[PDB]
């Protein structure tokens, strides 16, 4: 049911795929979207994964209110949604809807932390967040209301905080790679792109090859002690000296879902990795109009039970007045990784035909071997989905030496890996220059740093920065961005 | 550390209990509170239970926006919070924050449902809700922002919808009685208290004896078809005929947590039922003037291992910067069901000292018999908490037959089970009268709490306790939250 081609009209393909797969429904308020069960199940799955992992690290869940009074929020402004009335009565002070929870949580932290006995404090909350985005909205990727988790920790030393920052970053890599089969690059944000309220910002970056755009998948901040000075979060150490806590913060949103969609979708529609898919195997009985004698649906129900015994999430599409081909296309558009076809011949030979969504390959499998084989296949699918994706990621990055190679590489919708001197003036200059050169070619075009990757390619002695010509410190990943 | 006592100043005791147990933090905006880990973990337990149970029923989770246009919300009004500005710029049209999701979900239902092949449609969502309550706020019980689940379903027939209504209400009874050990009464609301947009409203009701006030614990509505008329949610049946859907909606909130605290809390603080306790057994090593520190700690570790192999959620408070008595009262005010103490003497005896939070009784238990005796004790604590609460509930209800006994019973902080004619005018009459007499005595009006499913025998010719016409059914009235 997907008519737009993915590599040609990418935007139309995306909107079509997310609507026709029954994942999102559009809404009369711009930038907001209904998340239907088909996408919300994926959200629940990654949420359970991340929650278990952070509970293993001693992180505890909380809920702080979504309203913050004006005087507490102010001590970014154009994006804040303000409540001024309840009914027709005006409030004595306008209250903001949560754009993030620093100004709600850190006063509580100031109260709760007095002693070194109170450290480390590790809190997380799953919640919704409202920001009146000026950029044009994209479902999942950039929405005016989005779901996320935000974690905030305070420690007695910077080293423990940095350790937690890196552990959370690894959990985000697993979120994207183990759950969603999306490859991401760990990296350090530049000083012009890092969270201004912190010391050092780490990130995972993903790549959309259709439009050649980089996107920040999740963020992890070594905040340091300036939030503690601002909010007076102090503690007495063992000697009795007052000291500031070292803080970290980290967050990840439903944007991940969108990334996943863009990574694995094809011309037929979605491809949902088996680890997060709401239905892993849909059983489609080959039946036409008004002649269901009970044989085929009976065997389909027995097979559903046998598969569910193996923890496989299974649905039987037994709806009438739909041809089997229609159902095939329906569940292919939805992205079900495995399709089980059971017809009269399969009933006669004790077999079933299983089709992979990602490659289309078919398999004849006897009933007795259904649960093992399918399990095998699912992992295969998952792994294949990652591998191909990573290949595409790596084929979208160009190593360059000079600024002359920037604009061609950008026009091939590629990221650029370049030796960079890392001084802050150079990034502003490079953004302005690439934007001007983008407009003069034109028949949001600015290139900024996406990350300074932890995984550094070799840096030969005497390599100069691709822009200023100063000695080059590290390889930096640049590109157009969301 | 709790010093106010539950049968003297109930409000002071309540806030002391929720603050000192590290469950609630007060917030500058009145009516809103910070849920700290200790309370949010209990919320997570009951959420997991209910989510699993409704997923067995084929209900699926979703998420609809929290914003509704003024257009669609106004097709109660003083409770709606309005967004009017982003930054400094005013919105062209103001936007409401979700007080409930009917006006957000039901247009999508009209769009999604076309045929009988789409029914039943069963959606649920866990979200927060904002209502600018005029009543005096109470942490958990009545807040301006609160967490809930709201489920909405659409069926082809009224039979199926009503069966789902009853299933959901049974799930709420299990939520309160099986997890929170809080006894509740199933019933239906009078026509003056039911959800005005629906046909029949079922409910479960709890009772706070210290102020004698009933409280609606959860609700489950048979909406009928009027919402289908209003939003045009119609489907073709197998004969090609266009029919309206029969809808249900149900919801329940963090209020349950409060009803737990007021139910099992005593003068030493909280008592958490073991089924919802993040920590069921806390292990406290006794270390003093350096005696057997390492051996005590090692056997604490292996005791934790042994107990977790039986699925017992165990925490070892080996924190060095706190004294054993401090840990004692910390975990006692927090409400942990069992405390296991291990000193040098018990290290020699091969035993451990176990104190149960609810009754305070202590046991000397072998290291070998620890797991089974602790599981026995945990289910004993859970069942006895429930049974004591059930006895208190039954003692707070007085069967009466004439209005002359209402306000006496109301003054002993009791509910009234009275025979009633079920006439709408009668209930407002009764509430205004009870209001006037409560004022004359100087604590609030009296309303119908519910009409219980388990009806006592109604002898023929029994008269309504207020009007005098033939009494239809036994109705539970009282003062309410
Ligand atoms: N409107 C949005 N919708 C969905 N996800 C978002 C949105 N804004 C930010 N995110 C994600 O949330 C993560 C943490 O939030 P945050 O650090 O506040 O983003 P940010 O600083 O506003 N970056 P950006 O808005 O893209 O310039 C980001 O790394 C994004 O992946
Ligand atoms: N402010 C609140 N805080 C906590 N729980 C609430 C609040 N309002 C309602 N609830 C609970 O949510 C359930 C479903 O909400 P709802 O039916 O809209 O309550 P309601 O009609 O407003 N009744 P009430 O406001 O108490 O007169 C109720 O049965 C209550 O148990
Ligand atoms: O949200 C953050 C910082 C961290 N907050 C905790 C979770 C991870 C996150 O990166 C950045 N940010 C983004 N957008 C805004 C809009 C309005 C007001 C404040 C902000 C604002 O502060
Ligand atoms: O929310 C309900 C009814 C049901 N909604 C679905 C979930 C279960 C719940 O009982 C009732 N109500 C209560 N309070 C309001 C305040 C403002 C606007 C609308 C309302 C409003 O409608
Ligand atoms: Mg932003
Ligand atoms: Mg209300």
Beta bridge partners of A269: A266
> Could you count the other beta carbons within 10 Å of the beta carbon of residue B271?
25
CB B117 within 8 A of CB A320: yes
> Where does residue B236 fall: left (phi above 0), alpha (psi -120 to 50 degrees), or beta otherwise?
beta
Distance B130 CA to ligand 5 centre (A): 25
Task: State the Cα–Cα distance between residues B58 and B123, nearest whole angstrom.
Answer: 9
CB B452 within 8 A of CB B249: no
Whether residues A81 and B83 touch (CB distance < 8 A) is answered with yes
Please give the C-alpha separations between residue B47 and each of A209, B24, B30, B52, in angstroms, as whole numbers: 40, 19, 26, 8
Q: Which residues of B touch A90 (CB under 8 A)?
A: none
Residues in chain A: 482
3-state secondary structure (DSSP) of residue A15 = helix
Closest ligand to the CA of B193: 2
CA nearest neighbour of B206 among B177, B178, B164: B177
CATH fold of B397-480, please?
Translation Initiation Factor IF3 (3.30.110)
What is the DSSP code string of B343-371? -HHHHHHTEEEEEETTT--EEEEESTTHH
Please give the C-alpha separations between residue A392 and each of A448, B450, B462, in angstroms, as whole numbers: 21, 63, 81
Task: State the Cα–Cα distance between residues B379 and A133, nearest whole angstrom.
Answer: 52
For residues B381, B384, B385 and B389, what is the CA-based torsion angle, rounded to 10 degrees? 180
Pairing mode of beta strands B447-452, B362-366: unpaired
Taking 3-state DSSP, the helix, strand and coil percentages for chain A, each rounded to the nearest 5, stand at 35, 30, 35
What residue in A sits closest to B25 (Cα-Cα)? A108
Task: State the Cα–Cα distance between residues A57 and A122, nearest whole angstrom.
Answer: 9
> Could you count the other beta carbons within 10 Å of the beta carbon of residue B284?
26
CB B333 within 8 A of CB B3: no
Residue B176: which residues within 8 A CB-CB, separation 6 or more? B182, B183, B184, B204, B206, B217, B218, B256, B259
Beta bridge partners of B187: B203, B452
Q: Name the residue facing B34 among A80, A97, A108 (closest C-beta).
A: A108
CB A445 within 8 A of CB A411: no
Pairing mode of beta strands B67-69, B281-285: unpaired
> Could you count the other beta carbons within 10 Å of the beta carbon of residue A325?
10
Taking the domains of chain B in order of start, what are their residue ranges? 1-273, 274-379, 397-480
Phi, psi of B368 (to 5 degrees): -75, -30
Query: Which ligand 1 atom sits nearest the alpha carbon of residue A203?
Result: 29
Whether residues B36 and A62 touch (CB distance < 8 A) is answered with yes
Task: State the Cα–Cα distance between residues B353 and A339, nearest whole angstrom.
Answer: 58
CA nearest neighbour of B269 among B37, B11, B16: B16
Task: State the Cα–Cα distance between residues A281 and A179, nearest whole angstrom.
Answer: 18
Task: State the Cα–Cα distance between residues B328 and B351, nearest whole angstrom.
Answer: 19
Pairing mode of beta strands B185-188, B447-452: antiparallel
Task: State the Cα–Cα distance between residues A278 and A21, nearest whole angstrom.
Answer: 12
Q: Name the residue facing B78 among A65, A86, A128 (closest C-beta).
A: A86
> Could you count the other beta carbons within 10 Å of the beta carbon of residue A425?
10
Q: Where are the alpha helices (DSSP H) in A235-308?
A: 255-264, 295-308
CB A472 within 8 A of CB A464: yes
Q: Is A397-481 a domain of CATH 3.30.110.30?
A: yes
Residue A424: which residues within 8 A CB-CB, separation 6 or more? A190, A191, A192
Task: State the Cα–Cα distance between residues B220 and B167, nearest whole angstrom.
Answer: 9
> Where does residue A464 fall: left (phi above 0), alpha (psi -120 to 50 degrees), or beta otherwise?
beta
Question: Given in angstroms, what resolution was this structure solved at?
Answer: 2.6
Task: State the Cα–Cα distance between residues B20 and A455, nearest whole angstrom.
Answer: 48
Task: State the Cα–Cα distance between residues B336 and B378, nearest whole angstrom.
Answer: 11
Residue with CA closest to ligand 2 atom 6: B142
User: Which string of b and e fits A21-59 if b means at least 16 CB within 10 Å?
Assistant: bebbbebebebbbbbbbbbbbbbbbbbebbbebbeeeeb
CB B41 within 8 A of CB A61: yes
Phi, psi of B353 (to 5 degrees): -100, 120
Q: How was this structure determined?
A: X-ray
> Could you count the other beta carbons within 10 Å of the beta carbon of residue B3?
9
Nearest chain A Cα distance for residue B215, angstroms: 24
Phi, psi of A252 (to 5 degrees): -150, 140
Task: State the Cα–Cα distance between residues A194 and A133, nearest whole angstrom.
Answer: 19
Which residues surround ligand 3 with Cβ inside 6 Å? A 76, 79-80, 99-100, 102, 131, 150, 195, 219, 221, 249-251
Element (H, E) at A236: strand A234-236
Count of A–B CB contacts within 8 Å?
144
Task: State the Cα–Cα distance between residues B262 and A107, nearest whole angstrom.
Answer: 29
Interface test with A, best of B22, B23, B25, B28 (most A CBs within 10 A): B28
Phi, psi of B208 (to 5 degrees): -100, 110
Distance B188 CA to ligand 4 centre (A): 17
CA atoms within 13 A on the CB side of A142: 12
CB B179 within 8 A of CB B366: no
What is the DSSP code string of B110-149? HHH--BGGG-SEEEEEEEEEE----SPPBTTTB-SEEEEE
Please give the C-alpha separations between residue B383 and each of A199, B217, B375, in angstroms, as whole numbers: 53, 20, 12
CB A171 within 8 A of CB A196: no
Element (H, E) at A102: helix A102-112
Pairing mode of beta strands A362-366, A351-356: antiparallel
> Could you count the other beta carbons within 10 Å of the beta carbon of residue A319?
14
CA nearest neighbour of A283 among A296, A270, A266, A269: A296
> Could you count the other beta carbons within 10 Å of the beta carbon of residue A175?
22
Angle at B56 between CA B51 and CA B60, to 5 degrees: 60
Cα A273 from chain centre: 14
Task: State the Cα–Cα distance between residues B401 and B417, nearest whole angstrom.
Answer: 8
Question: How many helices (H) and strands (E) are present in chain B, helices listed first?
Answer: 13, 23
Verify whether ligand 4 is closer than 6 Å to residue B80 (CB atom): yes
3-state secondary structure (DSSP) of residue B157 = coil
Both tokens assigned to B37: 């880990």
Angle at B150 between CA B149 and CA B152, to 5 degrees: 145
CB A119 within 8 A of CB A155: yes
Task: State the Cα–Cα distance between residues B471 and B468, nearest whole angstrom.
Answer: 8
CB A179 within 8 A of CB A273: yes
Both tokens assigned to B276: 């919802």
CA nearest neighbour of B46 among B142, B200, B178: B178
Distance B227 CA to ligand 2 centre (A): 20
CB B176 within 8 A of CB B184: yes
CATH architecture under which domain B274-379 falls: 3-Layer(aba) Sandwich (3.40)
What is the DSSP code string of A187-211? EEPPTTTS-TTSSEEEEEEEEETTT
Task: State the Cα–Cα distance between residues A267 and A129, nearest whole angstrom.
Answer: 33
Query: Which ligand 2 atom sits nearest the alpha carbon of residue B133?
Result: 1
Both tokens assigned to A130: 């409202």
Task: State the Cα–Cα distance between residues A168 and A156, nearest whole angstrom.
Answer: 18
Both tokens assigned to A25: 């429904």
Q: Where are the alpha helices (DSSP H) in B194-323?
A: 226-231, 255-264, 293-308
Pairing mode of beta strands A314-316, A281-285: parallel
Element (H, E) at B392: helix B370-395
3-state secondary structure (DSSP) of residue B270 = coil
CB A195 within 8 A of CB A222: no
CB B168 within 8 A of CB B62: no
Whether residues A117 and B34 touch (CB distance < 8 A) is answered with no
Task: State the Cα–Cα distance between residues A344 and A338, nearest whole angstrom.
Answer: 20
Task: State the Cα–Cα distance between residues A324 and B458, nearest whole angstrom.
Answer: 59
CA nearest neighbour of A271 among A317, A314, A332, A353: A332
Both tokens assigned to B297: 């700690």
What residue in B sits closest to A95 (Cα-Cα)? B29
Q: Which residues of A touch B69 (CB under 8 A)?
A: 28-29
> Could you count the other beta carbons within 10 Å of the beta carbon of residue A205?
23
Q: Is B1-273 a domain of CATH 3.30.930.10?
A: yes
Task: State the Cα–Cα distance between residues B93 and B83, nearest whole angstrom.
Answer: 9
Place of tokens 């990652």: A386
CA nearest neighbour of B271 among B332, B361, B354, B340: B332
**Angle of helix B158-174 versus helix B37-56 axis, rounded to 10:** 150
Question: How many helices (H) and strands (E) are present in chain A, helices listed first?
Answer: 13, 23
3-state secondary structure (DSSP) of residue B33 = strand
Phi, psi of A16 (to 5 degrees): -60, -45
Task: State the Cα–Cα distance between residues B358 and B266, nearest whole angstrom.
Answer: 8
Closest ligand to the CA of B100: 4
Residue A67: which residues within 8 A CB-CB, separation 6 or more? A83, A95, A96, A97, A98, B29, B32, B130, B145
3-state secondary structure (DSSP) of residue A107 = helix
Phi, psi of B413 (to 5 degrees): 55, 60
CA atoms within 13 A on the CB side of A227: 28
Task: State the Cα–Cα distance between residues B276 and B46, nearest whole angstrom.
Answer: 7
Both tokens assigned to A16: 């079509």
The DSSP output letter for B79 is: G
Task: State the Cα–Cα distance between residues B195 and B201, nearest whole angstrom.
Answer: 6
């Amino acid at each position: 049911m997907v008519t737009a081609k993915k590599d040609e009209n990418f935007s139309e393909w995306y909107t079509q795929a997310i609507v026709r797969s029954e994942m999102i429904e559009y809404y009369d308020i711009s930038g907001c979207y209904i998340m239907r069960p088909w996408a919300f199940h994926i959200w629940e799955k990654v949420q359970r994964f991340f929650d278990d992992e952070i509970k293993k690290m001693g992180v505890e869940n909380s809920y702080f209110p979504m309203f913050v009074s004006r005087h507490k929020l102010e001590k970014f402004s154009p994006e804040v949604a303000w409540v001024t009335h309840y009914g027709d009565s005006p409030l004595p002070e306008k209250i903001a809807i949560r754009p993030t929870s620093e100004t709600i949580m850190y006063p509580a932290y100031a109260k709760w932390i007095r002693s070194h006995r109170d450290l480390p404090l590790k809190l997380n909350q799953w919640c919704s967040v409202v920001r009146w985005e000026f950029k044009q909205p994209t479902p999942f990727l950039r929405t005016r209301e989005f779901l996320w988790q935000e974690g905030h920790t305070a420690h007695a030393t910077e080293e423990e905080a940095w350790e937690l920052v890196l552990d959370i970053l690894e959990l985000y890599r697993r979120w994207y790679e183990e759950c969603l089969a999306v490859p991401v690059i760990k990296g350090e944000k530049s000083e012009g792109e890092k969270f201004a309220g912190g010391k050092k910002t780490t990130t995972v970056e993903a790549f959309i090859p259709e439009n050649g755009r980089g996107i920040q998948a999740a963020t992890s901040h070594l905040l340091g002690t300036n939030f503690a000075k601002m909010f007076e979060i102090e503690f007495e150490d063992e000697e009795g000296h007052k000291r500031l806590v070292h803080q970290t913060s980290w967050g990840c949103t439903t944007r991940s879902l969108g990334v996943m969609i863009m990574t694995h979708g094809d011309d037929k529609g979605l491809v949902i990795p088996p680890r997060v898919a709401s239905v892993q195997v849909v059983i489609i009985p080959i039946l036409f109009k008004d002649e269901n004698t009970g044989e085929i649906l009976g065997k389909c129900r027995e097979l559903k039970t046998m598969l569910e015994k193996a923890d496989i999430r299974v649905r039987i599409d037994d709806r009438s007045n739909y041809t089997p081909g229609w159902k095939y296309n329906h569940w292919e558009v939805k992205g079900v990784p495995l399709r089980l076809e059971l017809g009269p011949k399969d009933l006669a030979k004790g077999t079933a035909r299983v089709v992979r969504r990602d490659t289309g390959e078919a398999y004849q499998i006897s009933w007795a071997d259904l649960a093992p084989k399918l399990l095998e296949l699912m992992e295969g699918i998952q792994r294949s989905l990652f591998e191909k994706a990573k290949a595409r990621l790596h084929e979208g990055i160009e190593k360059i030496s000079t600024f002359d190679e920037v604009m061609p590489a950008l026009n091939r919708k590629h990221l650029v890996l370049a030796p960079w001197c890392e001084d802050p003036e150079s990034e502003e200059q490079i953004k302005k220059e690439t934007q001007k050169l983008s407009e003069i070619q034109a028949i949001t075009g600015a290139m900024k740093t996406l990350c300074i990757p932890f995984d550094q390619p070799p840096m030969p002695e005497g390599t100069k920065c691709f822009y200023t010509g100063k000695p080059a410190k590290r390889w930096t990943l640049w590109g157009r961005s969301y």
